[PDB]
């Protein structure tokens, strides 16, 4: 050990307490002009703190306000240098700053239940995907229709080789009672297309906005669940002629207890309903889609689907 080296040491930090290194710990003979500085860095070496010691004849005293050290995390590595006059700095101690204080894990961590979610669906790959769970008619009731005759992207609907109605539940649930759904939809022919929010695990009860198109039945309803394939109209219908590529936003506001549907970029709800007798809360945050057609051909089908927590 020919060359002098630092002594590995540790520092203690507390939230709300002033950081202080007493003078009787940094002894030695310090001539006038000696300067001591303490440097705190992170795992990458970035300096997250620097302080100056009060060098005296035989002691060095450190005293910083708690706000100066509140940003220094546990595990941040420190380095104490003493510089005699007309000399290069000499490191006396180095090590780690541990925090001796009440520990709050819940403050730093965020639970998966306490996280807003946002889901997308494009149907451009011509496959259903693992995120949609068929309901009402069982496995294999869903399908993708190309709509190659017109310049349109593939849409999702019932398996018209077997069924004329179907439902699909988004595999994962939401994390809020309030929810926004944005659907870009195509009106190929006559049918009924339900956007379903606040659904239970088996889609027995839910709120929904139903777009119905036909020879003379182009309108929008607010529906409640009676099963994945059954529903009950609530309130009066609103006339609406769906065109190919139409974007509808179904927003359920929990604190308002109101499910509304806006068409395109309109700032006024196309339809609106409030005070529906449907359970809400944990276990009632699933979402999905449903289709019902008289003929075995696509009616109103969603090309693009989007869901997000909150309104």
């Amino acid at each position: 050990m020919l060359s002098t080296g630092p002594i590995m040491e540790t520092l203690t930090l507390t939230v709300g307490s002033a950081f202080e290194i007493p003078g009787w710990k940094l002894r030695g003979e310090y001539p006038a002009g000696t300067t001591s500085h303490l440097v705190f860095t992170d795992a990458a070496g970035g300096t997250l703190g620097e302080f100056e010691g009060t060098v005296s004849a035989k002691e060095i005293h450190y005293l910083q306000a708690p706000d100066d050290v509140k940003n220094i995390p546990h595990g941040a590595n420190f380095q104490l240098f003493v510089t005699y006059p007309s000399m290069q700095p000499q490191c006396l101690y180095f090590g780690t700053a541990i925090r001796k204080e009440p520990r709050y894990p819940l403050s730093t961590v965020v639970s998966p239940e306490d996280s807003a979610v946002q889901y997308k669906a494009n149907f451009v790959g011509q496959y259903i995907g693992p995120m949609w769970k068929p309901m009402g008619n069982g496995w294999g009731s869903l399908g993708i229709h190309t709509h190659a005759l017109i310049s349109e992207a593939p849409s999702m609907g019932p398996n018209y080789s077997l069924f004329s109605s179907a439902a699909a539940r988004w595999l994962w649930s939401m994390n809020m009672d309030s929810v926004t759904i944005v659907v870009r939809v195509l009106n190929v022919g006559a049918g009924k297309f339900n956007v379903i929010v606040c659904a239970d695990y088996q889609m027995q009860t839910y709120l929904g906005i139903q777009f119905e198109t036909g020879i003379s039945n182009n309108k929008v309803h607010v529906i409640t669940g009676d099963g994945p394939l059954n529903w009950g109209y609530q309130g009066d219908a609103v006339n609406n002629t769906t065109a190919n590529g139409d974007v509808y936003t179904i927003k359920y506001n929990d604190l308002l207890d109101t499910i509304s549907c806006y068409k395109g970029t309109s700032l006024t709800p196309l339809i609106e309903a409030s005070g529906l007798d449907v359970p809400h809360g944990e276990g009632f945050r699933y979402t999905g889609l449903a289709w019902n057609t008289a003929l075995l051909s696509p009616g109103v089908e969603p090309t693009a689907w989007e869901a997000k927590d909150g309104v």
Binding site: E113, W172, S173, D200, Y201, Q202, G281, E282, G283, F284
Partner: protein
Amino acid sequence: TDFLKIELIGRDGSHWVLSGPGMGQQGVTLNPNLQQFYDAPVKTLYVPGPFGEEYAGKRVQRREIVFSVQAYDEDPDTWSTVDSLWRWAWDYDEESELRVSTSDGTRFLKVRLMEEPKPYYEKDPHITADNPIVMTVTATFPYWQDEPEELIWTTLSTEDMTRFPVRNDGDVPVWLKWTLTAPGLWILPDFSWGNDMYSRGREDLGRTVAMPELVAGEHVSVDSDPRVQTLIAVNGMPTQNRWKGNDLLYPLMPGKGAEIPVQLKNAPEGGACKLTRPRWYSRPWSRPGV
């Protein structure tokens, strides 16, 4: 010490204080060096892997508590009475309670005689009238327990819904019990709580299971624990027979809890739902964790 109190309630209901304040008042004290008493025995499974062996899971083992007591009195006749009472406080078929009281509360373990006790010294015990009994008891359920929390919800409406507040303060998962009255269609929560034991941790976060419609007089006990059958009708009817390959799969994971929804429909005379939630711990005492 006054920081720890150990009691025994026998198969016959006798109350003994083995350690702590009031120990030895019934004549029996607890000797040192008791084993497998604090931590629940768990064996961890390991399977071959590229860098040795890979973790494969854990299996909790039943507790095998070997301890010793000392039965003492001033006269041999009363010593014999005390020793007989201590032996009567135990059995093989039926279990007796062993309570530990600390600043963290009171937690009990149900224990039974694993083998015959080993009493007395080499000479006849009436000489000393102060003799040790070596007890080898076992806990089939290895978790220390507190009294389970019971919640009652009675409704007169045909259709109703409630939110049961539920929370797991222990360090191990617990299995819920439901007592549902009949008639009526019940929907009970089976939330995964993030448990991924069926590869559906996020899919079953808000999972609800619908019990079969109950006819009049068919009150059901729905116990989620693997030891008991899920559905038991009080009248002996096969209620599980009408339930179409469905079950309660998820316990209450530690540190998790919410207002679980319970729904009742098609109930001409209302209905009552009781939720029993056990409080299971792996240690006789521990500070709350979250």
